[PDB]
Symmetry: C3
Subunit: 230 residues, 3 copies
């Protein structure tokens, strides 16, 4: 098609589709009520992403935003996907370590503020204000990262060894890949505009696939997702 980033949108669509199908077939027959929750959560994540990658591929998920005296292409469908997928991914982690309800609310609520302030920043027509929104969004993210190291890492250790080991890996995956998101937004098409749109779209595609399908491959092969049973 006529937008150079199309190839990375097509490839993202295909990878999320294949991931959904694999997790769906792999979850068939699972009867353990605990693993059923982890399959439910983890298969819904790439199914949502599939539909929203497709909407960007087909042009629905794209709008033009005037700032810096120019009509800027903004993919708003990213924030519609992230709004529902990112709390499910934190739910996978919190259920692993059997977090208490107060802590789950805090994580999901902070996650909503991070995504919502990011959408306002993406659509903001006053250039300098877009970075104010980027700052508030990044602060909400640092709160989440703090919780994952100084609330969760200290209960998982008092848990089943298989739980503690699977959580450590997935926590480390989460902190590394989530930290790259604020930087790519800042230097790409929504921010300073140093990196062009087609390269920004490739970077996000590599990040989006790793943090959902990669994460899922690690979790759903683990023994931690089953109750202990004879």
């Amino acid at each position: 098609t006529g937008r150079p980033e199309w190839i990375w949108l097509a490839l993202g669509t295909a990878l999320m589709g294949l991931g959904t199908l694999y997790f769906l077939v792999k979850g068939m027959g699972v009867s353990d009520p605990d693993a059923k929750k982890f399959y439910a959560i983890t298969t819904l994540v790439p199914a949502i992403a599939f539909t929203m990658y497709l909407s960007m591929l087909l042009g629905y998920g794209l709008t033009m935003v005037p700032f810096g005296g120019e009509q800027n292409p903004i993919y708003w469908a990213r924030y519609a996907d992230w709004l529902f997928t990112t709390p499910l991914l934190l739910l996978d982690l919190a259920l692993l370590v059997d977090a208490d309800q107060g802590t789950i609310l805090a994580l999901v609520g902070a996650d909503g503020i991070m995504i919502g302030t990011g959408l306002v920043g993406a659509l903001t027509k006053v250039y300098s204000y877009r970075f104010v929104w980027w700052a508030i969004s990044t602060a909400a993210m640092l709160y989440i990262l703090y919780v994952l190291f100084f609330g969760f890492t200290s209960k998982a250790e008092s848990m089943r060894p298989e739980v503690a080991s699977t959580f450590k890996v997935l926590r480390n995956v989460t902190v590394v890949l989530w930290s790259a998101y604020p930087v790519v937004w800042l230097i790409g098409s929504e921010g300073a505009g140093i990196v062009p749109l087609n390269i920004e779209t490739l970077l996000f595609m590599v990040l989006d696939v790793s943090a959902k399908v990669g994460f899922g491959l690690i979790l759903l092969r683990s023994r931690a997702i089953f109750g202990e049973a004879e």
Copy 2:
């Protein structure tokens, strides 16, 4: 008013209003914590629908969408109602059979994908793509229907006989009436345009009232909604 479908919107509004009022008066005094949940869920459903039928009657819930080189009337308020009412109706069924949490998440999440992809298809400006969205939405629906027969029908039987009998009736009601929705959309104003808007609006009105107020009349007269008590 000046749109021929107004009479079916007015009648839908009145029927949802009367239904809400009846379920509200009937639920007064109920103290059983179990029946309270079924009344809560089941009365919220026609109250939401009342407000959204009214917005279509008054013109707020209507927009024009250009496709096939024509300005097409699209009632978007349908998807704002269905987004909150359809998961409540599946919650009535899952609580009946005491479904496990993993299965409820799967049903509600699949329901969200079905409604969300339906809204994208309703607003899509490229004619042939509207049917791609219709196909993904229908696939999410088939997943839901499968769950209701090959996950739920097999636990309800291991339950109280009054539960098993009320669920069978409501499951059958659900599968028959929900299957008509994809067909009416395809042949009506959002799709191929064979059936005109005023007749499509009548068909949906008959389907919307039956699946909410009819469903509710069956459930709230049943003994299944109470715990077993002496």
Copy 3:
């Protein structure tokens, strides 16, 4: 800036920010799983409000709506904030008295109808219809107020005395301050237009800060938020 109401938006922003920071520092170290829920809920409330007051300050949260043959400034960001903060505030109360699930659903669902019909009324382009939406919204509110006196006040009394006393105060705070909202909307810029926008913005600022940060100061100093323990 060039809108006279800016000073009340700036002051609201600052007060919600300071409130968030105070509740955040005060909740540090709390380990009781019960108080953790009350801190989680109660700190998220002024953090959401901070971001949405800021969006009104910076102009993002403002739109123009044509009615009465005039282009009317409508702050739509109010309803985006109230949509997520008002159910959390009712969750604080229901958890205090350990409400049953059916009753919480009813309150949160009625709250959604009240806010949603209020947004439709704020954006409605036919003047006389805006008050129809105001009436349906006010009816949903009266339902909520009824529940708080003739469902909750009668279980809190059968509870811990510290719970019963803290709930009475917060219930009374809630009923008084929430009842002022329908009146200010009716006589201000969204309704009859008797009170001008800058004064309406001051009134709401005083109401918004009292009902969130004031409410929170009362609740989080109470002993009711902790389980009974030795």
